[PDB]
Enzyme design. Structure first.
Site, PDB file in Angstrom:
ATOM      1  N   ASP A 157    -114.626  53.336 -58.320  1.00 26.00           N
ATOM      2  CA  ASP A 157    -115.192  51.931 -57.831  1.00 26.00           C
ATOM      3  C   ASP A 157    -116.405  51.435 -58.984  1.00 26.00           C
ATOM      4  O   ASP A 157    -116.519  50.864 -59.268  1.00 26.00           O
ATOM      5  CB  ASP A 157    -115.473  52.010 -56.472  1.00 26.00           C
ATOM      6  N   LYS A 182    -110.692  60.951 -48.761  1.00 24.98           N
ATOM      7  CA  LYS A 182    -110.891  60.589 -49.876  1.00 24.98           C
ATOM      8  C   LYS A 182    -111.309  61.809 -50.689  1.00 24.98           C
ATOM      9  O   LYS A 182    -110.609  62.089 -51.879  1.00 24.98           O
ATOM     10  CB  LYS A 182    -112.132  59.659 -50.013  1.00 24.98           C
ATOM     11  N   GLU A 238    -114.108  48.610 -60.024  1.00 23.42           N
ATOM     12  CA  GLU A 238    -113.123  48.017 -59.200  1.00 23.42           C
ATOM     13  C   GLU A 238    -113.316  46.325 -59.096  1.00 23.42           C
ATOM     14  O   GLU A 238    -114.336  46.016 -59.554  1.00 23.42           O
ATOM     15  CB  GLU A 238    -113.819  48.300 -57.979  1.00 23.42           C
TER      16      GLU A 238
HETATM   17  O1  U5P Z   1    -103.010  51.279 -54.160  1.00 17.78           O
HETATM   18  C1  U5P Z   1    -103.930  50.616 -53.450  1.00 17.78           C
HETATM   19  C2  U5P Z   1    -105.211  51.248 -53.704  1.00 17.78           C
HETATM   20  C3  U5P Z   1    -106.376  50.403 -52.872  1.00 17.78           C
HETATM   21  N1  U5P Z   1    -105.818  49.905 -51.907  1.00 17.78           N
HETATM   22  C4  U5P Z   1    -106.826  49.466 -51.068  1.00 17.78           C
HETATM   23  O2  U5P Z   1    -108.009  48.909 -51.847  1.00 17.78           O
HETATM   24  C5  U5P Z   1    -109.271  49.224 -51.146  1.00 17.78           C
HETATM   25  C6  U5P Z   1    -109.910  49.782 -52.033  1.00 17.78           C
HETATM   26  O3  U5P Z   1    -109.490  51.177 -52.429  1.00 17.78           O
HETATM   27  P1  U5P Z   1    -110.179  52.331 -52.895  1.00 17.78           P
HETATM   28  O4  U5P Z   1    -111.308  51.910 -53.906  1.00 17.78           O
HETATM   29  O5  U5P Z   1    -111.290  52.723 -51.644  1.00 17.78           O
HETATM   30  O6  U5P Z   1    -109.017  53.404 -53.260  1.00 17.78           O
HETATM   31  C7  U5P Z   1    -109.042  49.994 -49.658  1.00 17.78           C
HETATM   32  O7  U5P Z   1    -108.771  48.873 -48.595  1.00 17.78           O
HETATM   33  C8  U5P Z   1    -107.648  50.407 -49.935  1.00 17.78           C
HETATM   34  O8  U5P Z   1    -106.541  50.865 -48.946  1.00 17.78           O
HETATM   35  C9  U5P Z   1    -104.418  49.692 -51.639  1.00 17.78           C
HETATM   36  O9  U5P Z   1    -104.184  49.278 -50.522  1.00 17.78           O
HETATM   37  N2  U5P Z   1    -103.611  50.288 -52.374  1.00 17.78           N
HETATM   38 MN    MN Z   2    -113.178  52.412 -52.976  1.00 16.31          MN
HETATM   39 MN    MN Z   3    -111.140  51.560 -56.064  1.00 17.81          MN
END
Ligand code: U5P
Ligand code: MN
Ligand code: MN
Length: 179
Positions: free
Chosen positions: A89, A115, A61
């Site tokens: 991540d 998730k 990430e």
């Molecule tokens: O296309 C995306 C992908 C991720 N997130 C945001 O990025 C953060 C991490 O996403 P994840 O690693 O938990 O999917 C969270 O706030 C999630 O909403 C978005 O807004 N849009």
């Molecule tokens: Mn995440």
């Molecule tokens: Mn992520």
């Protein structure tokens, strides 16, 4: 809330968050709650990565997409681990598994299910944190030691307290939407 994010998160995190939002056509100055959420998720991922011994984790990430996939593909080729459908991540060298981190303003169980729905038959481990000290992980396997988890939980609680002191918490808490 914008002033708050700039004040409480380090500049690297803020820049990454702004970039992610802009990539989606969103203005960090307007969708401030989202801005804060992305920053928070990023901080947790970095804190989580710092939790183990040196070299335990690879951070996925926060990297640009090309680099992120390069790391993921590289890991899969060398360790034999199955390639995920979407970017995870982190990767855990010790347990040899990818990890998906979630930080929720709602409740951990609902977020975990959401998730899991995305991951499906995926072999990616899931770890969810809340701003109130709760956590939920796949097979109740928490990966990190309690002290490490405690630091993350405390930091999140602290962020929540700071937001509330500024009257930003109620709006922030209510801005998370279901899958
Ligand atoms: O296309 C995306 C992908 C991720 N997130 C945001 O990025 C953060 C991490 O996403 P994840 O690693 O938990 O999917 C969270 O706030 C999630 O909403 C978005 O807004 N849009
Ligand atoms: Mn995440
Ligand atoms: Mn992520």
């Amino acid at each position: 809330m914008e002033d708050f994010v700039r004040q409480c998160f380090n500049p690297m995190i803020v820049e990454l968050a702004e970039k992610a939002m802009k990539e989606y056509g969103e203005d960090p100055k307007i969708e401030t709650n989202k801005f804060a959420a992305i920053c928070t998720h990023l901080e947790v991922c970095f804190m989580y990565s710092d939790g183990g011994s040196k070299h335990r984790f690879e951070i996925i990430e926060g990297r640009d997409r090309i680099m992120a996939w390069t790391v993921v593909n590289s890991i899969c080729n060398t360790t034999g681990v199955e390639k995920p459908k979407s970017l995870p991540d982190l990767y855990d060298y010790k347990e040899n598994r990818f990890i998906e981190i979630g930080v929720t303003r709602r409740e951990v169980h609902i977020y975990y299910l959401e998730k899991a729905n995305k991951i499906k038959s995926e072999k990616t481990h899931i770890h969810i944190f809340s701003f109130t000290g709760e956590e939920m992980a796949t097979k109740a396997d928490y990966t990190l030691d309690e002290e490490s988890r405690a630091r993350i939980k405390t930091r999140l609680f602290t962020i929540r307290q700071e937001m509330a002191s500024r009257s930003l918490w109620d709006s922030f808490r209510q801005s998370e939407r279901a899958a």
